Write an enzyme that holds these catalytic residues in place. Sequence first.
Site, PDB file in Angstrom:
ATOM      1  N   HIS A  40       0.773  -1.260   0.070  1.00 42.23           N
ATOM      2  CA  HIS A  40       0.072  -0.139  -0.109  1.00 42.23           C
ATOM      3  C   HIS A  40       0.948   1.319   0.022  1.00 42.23           C
ATOM      4  O   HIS A  40       1.922   1.408   0.464  1.00 42.23           O
ATOM      5  CB  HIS A  40      -0.903   0.079   1.290  1.00 42.23           C
ATOM      6  CG  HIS A  40      -1.544  -1.131   1.580  1.00 42.23           C
ATOM      7  ND1 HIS A  40      -2.611  -1.710   0.806  1.00 42.23           N
ATOM      8  CD2 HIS A  40      -1.600  -2.128   2.481  1.00 42.23           C
ATOM      9  CE1 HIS A  40      -3.119  -2.725   1.347  1.00 42.23           C
ATOM     10  NE2 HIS A  40      -2.429  -2.833   2.398  1.00 42.23           N
ATOM     11  N   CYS A  90      -4.876   4.471  -2.158  1.00 43.38           N
ATOM     12  CA  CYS A  90      -3.571   3.719  -2.246  1.00 43.38           C
ATOM     13  C   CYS A  90      -3.625   3.621  -3.771  1.00 43.38           C
ATOM     14  O   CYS A  90      -4.648   3.191  -4.413  1.00 43.38           O
ATOM     15  CB  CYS A  90      -3.918   2.276  -1.656  1.00 43.38           C
ATOM     16  SG  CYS A  90      -2.794   1.099  -1.887  1.00 43.38           S
ATOM     17  N   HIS A  93      -4.318  -0.221  -5.165  1.00 46.04           N
ATOM     18  CA  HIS A  93      -5.564  -0.695  -4.846  1.00 46.04           C
ATOM     19  C   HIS A  93      -6.662   0.046  -4.945  1.00 46.04           C
ATOM     20  O   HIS A  93      -7.939  -0.048  -4.787  1.00 46.04           O
ATOM     21  CB  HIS A  93      -5.532  -1.136  -3.231  1.00 46.04           C
ATOM     22  CG  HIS A  93      -4.553  -2.227  -3.115  1.00 46.04           C
ATOM     23  ND1 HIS A  93      -3.863  -2.400  -1.877  1.00 46.04           N
ATOM     24  CD2 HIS A  93      -4.325  -3.432  -3.815  1.00 46.04           C
ATOM     25  CE1 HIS A  93      -3.143  -3.401  -2.089  1.00 46.04           C
ATOM     26  NE2 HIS A  93      -3.483  -4.143  -3.291  1.00 46.04           N
ATOM     27  N   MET A  98      -9.700   0.966  -2.749  1.00 46.15           N
ATOM     28  CA  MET A  98      -9.067   1.713  -1.512  1.00 46.15           C
ATOM     29  C   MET A  98      -8.894   2.930  -1.774  1.00 46.15           C
ATOM     30  O   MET A  98      -7.813   3.521  -2.166  1.00 46.15           O
ATOM     31  CB  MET A  98      -7.510   0.917  -1.391  1.00 46.15           C
ATOM     32  CG  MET A  98      -6.947   1.246  -0.340  1.00 46.15           C
ATOM     33  SD  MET A  98      -5.798  -0.163   0.502  1.00 46.15           S
ATOM     34  CE  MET A  98      -4.824   0.558   1.878  1.00 46.15           C
TER      35      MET A  98
END
Length: 106
Positions: A40, A90, A93, A98
């Site tokens: 991340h 992120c 992601h 995310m």
Amino acid sequence: METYTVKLGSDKGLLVFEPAKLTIKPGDTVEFLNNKVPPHNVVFDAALNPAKSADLAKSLSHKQLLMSPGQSTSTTFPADAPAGEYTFYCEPHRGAGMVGKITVAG
Ligand SMILES: [Cu+2]
């Protein structure tokens, strides 16, 4: 001044920030903690912050992927951070969902 912690990857292993929304004051700190399902990072959106300032967004972001277990980074918001919404995500992601949002308020 307060510190709030946002897990990168939820305890249940979902590709999210846990929690995904938080409200803080200027001067507060958000700690981003590598938790589950790497890798991340934490990139603030250049346009979706109250000043629409790419420099503000760069200053709050951690573009480098967190590559060690339980690695921590933190963003201490400036005293003069303007009130409103700060969208972040992120990169790996992002398309999995995310994405997060910090609201700065009084
Ligand atoms: Cu991620």
